[PDB]
């Protein structure tokens, strides 16, 4: 990445930052029990609030049965067809059966407990975790229930509680993201799902794990329970991976507004220079937390442009003021002073910009007071290299992003081609 010699074109590289990837996962098994346990007589409203839940899970036991494609009757030694997006999806689900005899052993126990979260486990690292439905607040309403004196007029507080909880449910269950599951119980993933190297977390790491996709693998109607196999990540600080955000401004050419159409982000990884689609990664203070390696190679032009030789960059034509005309590059200010008024020091001292130059760099304290179409500021430092004026940057590659213009232009290219052969 070459940041200098690039501001003079309207490409404004921004904020070198690190990169982290979730290349491997440490799976667990969440076992939600959607019924609370009451520790005194009966709550007369339990049956009715139970009946409300019967509408949801009864849809789910055939939401899985009759949906499984039986991609793996072979067990990790009439499949028809299935892709790697499912191979890894169900091979990880193949591991559920070997733990099915294990998870079921807990399901026989959590049924009779009165505790919100239990992290019972077998292996040294892996641990299954049991989460009850509203047992957190149940202990905070059965304790007042001694004051309210009743299965109801007391269980009414439970009655509204589960209905509200039911109102919370069916929202993300109506591919679930981990945020919803934590949302029901007001808890957070660093309290229940953190062990060994999967324990020390940042604040940005916390949100990335909550953004991963959680899979449902089993529903038992009798227990009203749902089995969730999460994939907790291990984020290694991938080396030599800098992700520079890129912005563009209206590089003027002969009173017409043009800009260089770079992608949302660009990376440098050794020789790799192609951009990225960071629509999925959680941004950190000094790094990017990506599930995969989002890097996709750019064109030769947009990769030769970002290593300099700006005499290769694509040159789109501006339509609608989505691209800016002025931005604060370092302490100083860079602007397209032909279209927007810059004026330097004196508010009335509207500075002329030559018609053959795109953006005029205002830095090195030539204008200690700068007013962009109004307003006032004070440049500091490092926005230029001694008012660095480059050569006549002649941009050749003018590209249009609408398919109509491309089609129309080649129609002319097709038409004269027929005329050209004679």
């Amino acid at each position, epitope marked *: 990445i070459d940041i200098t010699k690039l501001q003079h074109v309207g490409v404004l590289v921004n904020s070198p930052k690190g990169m982290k990837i979730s290349q491997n996962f440490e799976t667990r098994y969440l076992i939600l029990s959607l019924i609370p346990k009451i520790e005194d007589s009966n709550s007369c409203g339990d049956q009715q609030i139970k009946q409300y839940k019967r509408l949801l899970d009864r849809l789910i036991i055939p939401l899985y049965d009759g949906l499984k494609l039986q991609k793996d009757v072979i067990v990790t030694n009439a499949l028809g067809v299935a892709t790697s997006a499912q191979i890894t999806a169900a091979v990880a689900l193949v591991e559920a059966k*070997q733990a099915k*005899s*294990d998870i*079921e*052993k*807990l399901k*026989e*126990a*959590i049924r*009779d*407990t009165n505790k919100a979260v*239990q*992290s*019972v*486990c*077998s*292996s*040294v690292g892996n641990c*299954i975790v049991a989460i009850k439905s509203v047992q957190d607040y149940v202990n905070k309403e059965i304790v007042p229930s001694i004051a309210r004196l009743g299965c109801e007029a007391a269980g009414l507080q439970l009655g509204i509680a589960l209905t509200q909880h039911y109102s919370e449910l069916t929202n993300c269950f109506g591919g679930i993201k981990l945020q919803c599951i934590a949302s029901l119980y007001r808890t957070n993933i660093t309290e229940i799902f953190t062990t060994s190297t999967v324990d020390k977390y940042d604040i940005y790491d916390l949100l990335f794990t909550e953004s991963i996709k959680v899979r449902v693998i089993d529903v038992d109607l009798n227990d009203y329970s749902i089995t969730l196999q999460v994939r907790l990540p291990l984020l290694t600080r991938l080396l030599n991976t800098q992700i520079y955000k890129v912005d563009s401004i209206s590089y003027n050419i002969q009173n017409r507004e043009w800009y260089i159409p770079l992608p949302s982000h660009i990376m440098t990884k050794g020789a790799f220079l192609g951009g990225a689609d960071v629509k999925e990664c959680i941004e950190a203070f000094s790094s990017y937390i990506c599930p995969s390696d989002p890097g996709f190679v750019l064109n030769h032009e947009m990769e030769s442009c970002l290593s300099g030789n700006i005499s290769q960059c694509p040159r789109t034509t501006v339509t609608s003021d989505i691209v800016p005309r002025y931005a604060f590059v370092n302490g100083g200010v860079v602007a397209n002073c032909i279209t927007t008024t810059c004026t330097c020091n004196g508010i009335g001292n509207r500075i002329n910009q030559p018609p053959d130059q795109g953006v005029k760099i205002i830095t090195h304290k030539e204008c200690n007071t700068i007013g962009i179409n109004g307003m006032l500021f004070n440049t500091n430092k490092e926005g230029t290299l001694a008012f660095y004026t480059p050569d006549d940057i002649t941009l050749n590659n003018s590209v249009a992003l609408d398919p109509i213009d491309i089609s129309i232009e080649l129609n002319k290219v097709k038409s004269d081609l027929e005329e050209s052969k004679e």
Partner: antibody
Amino acid sequence: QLLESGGGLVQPGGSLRLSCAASGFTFSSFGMSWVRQSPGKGLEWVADISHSAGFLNYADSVKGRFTVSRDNSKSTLHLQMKSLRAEDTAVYYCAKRLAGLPDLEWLLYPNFLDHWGQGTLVTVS
Amino acid sequence: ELTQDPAVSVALGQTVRITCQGDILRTYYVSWYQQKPGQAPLLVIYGKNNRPSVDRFSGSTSGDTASLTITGAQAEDEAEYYCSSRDRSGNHVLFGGGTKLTV
């Protein structure tokens, strides 16, 4: 905690029913387990029971020929014996798993047998 | 099944180590058992912790082997050690041959 009842004298191909009562012990809240010890050898694995009757796990000669029954009402653990032949002459201890409802952290481990009862005698003539 | 040393003997003191190795214990805890000959066995080490009745010995789990290390010798320890583990699948339990010990 004390757990043993004893009583057994049979003939090859016969039947028997061992039992053990866990006095001063939360029988329903805690799992159960039996272990066989040949007189000339070490210990070995026979049958497992959960806190409830939901899961019965057996390894009787690595197959199914015995049935062990749990009863929470009288807090006794019963194992049904039948068709003994050349492989069962040993002593039997009634055992209780360490884990349970109050402390489920070790529920997934069925070999953490906390306290063992006195050995009972069986014979294959 | 997991195995161990058939037997071992020492003098009346110093310290003693008991080994254990097999196709298991790589990702599973260990449960060392002693029984005085003619009596029901007792648990000494469940997981990495120790039973309070036992302090005197705690053992050490390794990557592929288990090891229970004990020190001293008294009117105790004249009995063999059984090294046990949870089954690979989670259904059975496995027991090794007793390592007869004399002070």
